Each structure stands twice: as structure tokens, then as C-alpha cells.
Ligand binder design. Structure first.
Ligand SMILES: [Ca+2]
Ligand SMILES: [Cl-]
Length: 123
């Protein structure tokens, strides 16, 4: 869900307030996402959006009537490393991996503040 994802982002980027820094960034970071990503951070968000699309197609998630946005997976953060819980079921695990991949991606790309709060006509 959002609470775990936000915690993962802070795990990798301890200086960030994700719900303020990454939301409404570029064409993909935040609600919806379409068009050409504007930079590598936006591509991280595009990948993440696509990972959620795939989670919704996974048989485990469908049978569990899962919503990736509300998934109740478990994770831990130690020394700025994210570990998705081994106890997560297949659906939970998939979504945890989407979130972990994105948090890692965000930590590895530049932040271009000219893309914060981008007008979606640019998308
Ligand atoms: Ca999005
Ligand atoms: Cl990690």
C-alpha cells in the first residue's frame, strides 16, 4: 500500500519526504501516467505504474481480489536496504518487489525539480 511504499522510499532516500517530493513529478509519478517520460525518475515511475498493471493480471492477485494500491505486504528497512518479507504471499511479494524496485530506482536517478508539478499537457 502507500504507507509501505513511502517507507521504502525513505529507506533508500533518507532525506526525502516522498509524499511531498515524488508525488506529482513528471508525467508518471503520481496519479495516472501517460505520454513520454520526461527523465529517468519519470521512467522509474512509468515502470512502477506498469508493475502495478502486471500485478493486477497475476492469478494470485486476482484470486485474492487484490488491489495493488492497498496491498498489505510486509517489508523491513535495515541500513538503507529494503527486504521484502519472505512471508509475503505471491501477490504481496510481487507488489512488494514493484515498490522496492521503484524505491531503488528513485535513489539512483537525478531529481530535476523543473519536472515537479508538471502540467500534464506535456504528457
Ligand atoms: Ca503513476
Ligand atoms: Cl535495497
Amino acid at each position: 500500500a502507500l504507507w509501505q511504499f513511502n517507507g521504502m522510499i525513505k529507506c533508500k532516500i533518507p532525506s526525502s519526504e516522498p509524499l511531498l517530493d515524488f508525488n506529482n513529478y513528471g508525467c508518471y509519478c503520481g496519479l495516472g501516467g501517460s505520454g513520454t517520460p520526461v527523465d529517468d525518475l519519470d521512467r522509474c515511475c512509468q515502470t512502477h505504474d506498469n508493475c502495478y498493471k502486471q500485478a493486477k493480471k497475476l492469478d494470485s492477485c486476482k484470486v485474492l481480489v487484490d488491489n495493488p494500491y492497498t496491498n498489505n505486504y510486509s517489508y523491513s528497512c535495515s541500513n538503507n536496504e529494503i527486504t521484502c518479507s519472505s512471508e509475503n504471499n505471491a501477490c504481496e511479494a510481487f507488489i512488494c518487489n514493484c515498490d522496492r524496485n521503484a524505491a531503488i530506482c528513485f535513489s539512483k536517478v537525478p531529481y530535476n525539480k523543473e519536472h515537479k508539478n508538471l502540467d500534464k499537457k506535456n504528457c
